[PDB]
Amino acid sequence: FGTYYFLQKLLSKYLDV
Amino acid sequence: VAGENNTQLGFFFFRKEDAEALIEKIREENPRLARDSKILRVPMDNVYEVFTTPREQTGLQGIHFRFMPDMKQVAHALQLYKDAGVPTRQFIGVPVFQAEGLTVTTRDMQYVPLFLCKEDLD
Amino acid sequence: XXXXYXXXXXXXXXXXXXXXXXXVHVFRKXXXXXXX
Amino acid sequence: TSLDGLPETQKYVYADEWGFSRVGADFPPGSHPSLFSQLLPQALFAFDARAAVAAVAVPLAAMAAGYGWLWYMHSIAPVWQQALCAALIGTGYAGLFKVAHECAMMRFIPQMPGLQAALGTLLMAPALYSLPSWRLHHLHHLLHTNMLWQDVWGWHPLTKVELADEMVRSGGSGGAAMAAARLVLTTPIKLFASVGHWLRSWDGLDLRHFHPASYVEVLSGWAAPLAFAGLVLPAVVSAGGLSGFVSCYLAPWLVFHFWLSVLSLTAHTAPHIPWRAEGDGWDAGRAAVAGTVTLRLPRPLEVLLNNANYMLPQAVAPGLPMWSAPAAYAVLAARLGPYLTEASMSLKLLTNHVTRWQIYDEEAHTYRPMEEVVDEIEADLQQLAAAAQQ
Ligand SMILES: CC(C)CCC[C@@H](C)[C@H]1CC[C@H]2[C@@H]3CC=C4C[C@@H](OC(=O)CCC(=O)O)CC[C@]4(C)[C@H]3CC[C@]12C
């Protein structure tokens, strides 16, 4: 579980600059 | 049914199995028209009405509506015909049956019933 | 009008020439048509 | 890099044995698959309306022609005419689905992000695919490309030690699991294994796999598929009966899934491509460029599927538009020619995927046939039993 917490975290950081 | 030199004709079958067999023959040569069929049942009322109309108003250059009685009752009709004394094997029209002395009486008068079916007649 | 019949598979004649082969045989002497 | 540097004669005879148009050269470690994006001209990232509208409306017209042809003779058609219409509609939908997969990575019309997300959702719906789960799985693929035990959203190969473990865990090759694996990886149903991928989306329909600040977006993503299979799928059946469903929906579905599965399977599988676990010799640029394959199509199919086979021009440049994917490839062979790999449409390639390349062994680092592998690990079971009789 929580298997996409981190990828989505980083994608949000980078695409919403 | 299309023919030669621009001819067509309408049909009216006293037993729906005749038209069903006709479109089963249609399926033999045309599957589209055989899926495009639907079976209608109307009295002689409006077909007699359209008989009493200008046929070229709806489009006529050789469309001759005819009837098609079943062969059972026309055979019974012709055996009636030739048990009288003049033996032939051809018929005119659609066979109707009646009986002498027979007449259906109402509360007011004695009307005459007409039977297309010798079975129902007798 | 009238139509002639002969109980033979019975043949029929209109005043094209239907043949009621015991099925049917729509002779001509192709039912590709409809009302308009 | 598995059959790396040696005379090009034997790599060419290998390419002819396998149906491959080329075998790659040597690639050194320490690189980034985004490096070679610096080569492409600054006009290959251009935007234009006509190419995109063609890319969306051409497979649309293919599908529409197929439907019209079918509804013209809805069910009176013979079997192979039905197969032709099914194949045509499935190919048109594969093209529309590639347009979808483009707008999912935000590189189709970045000018309108909302309109393009709505377009991607609408076009993914008829195939029962959720846009955000697809995007997550595709990024998770790009990150772990050809990595062992890590890229499960691609064609993860079945290895040897795990199959021996299952062999012991089932108590022979007569259980349901072993028979299922055999029948799925041996017959042409493998060419449809993408169906299983479709069942691995909907991650249990469980929001506990995602980031909380995304819940309201993930659920809406599962909405457009469900709504479809809740509204349209009934109507069709209602107006077409069981057969009328196996005709206008299920067959184009199997066509699109065939196209998807074969595209991926031939894009990232080959005997000259090893599958290393990272730490034990993995690299990004290496497993990206060296461990890949590009397939050739007839230009009709290439204008239909919308460049559906050019996966590397957009793996070196994740922001490269779709009508420029061939042109960019024109540049790449100019620079990395010796390291590229290529192949063509051939039933021989598929037959070797079906019968020859079935089990991946990490010792020889290549693919082997399944019956030989299964008899030989039965022989190794005989060996370990011989070591176990005393
Ligand atoms: C019936 C058809 C014509 C219409 C479309 C139906 C789909 C929306 C259904 C059919 C198969 C379903 C899947 C079948 C199996 C599962 C596993 C199930 O989850 C689990 O079993 C949890 C994990 C576990 O038990 O180990 C529920 C989600 C999912 C993906 C289902 C999601 C919804 C799916 C794709």
TrEMBL record, chain A:
Q: Transmembrane stretches, by residue range?
A: none
Q: What is the name listed in the Swiss-Prot or TrEMBL entry for this protein?
A: Cell division protein
What are the coiled-coil residue ranges? none
Domain of life, per the record? Eukaryota
TrEMBL record, chain D:
Write the record's keywords in alphabetical order, separated by commas.
Membrane, Transmembrane, Transmembrane helix
- List membrane-spanning regions: 51-73, 79-100, 214-237, 249-267
Which GO MF terms does the UniProt record name? Answer: oxidoreductase activity
Highest taxon listed in the record's lineage: Eukaryota
Q: What is this protein called?
A: Fatty acid desaturase domain-containing protein
Which species is listed as the source? Chlamydomonas reinhardtii
Span within the entire protein?
261 to 650 of 682
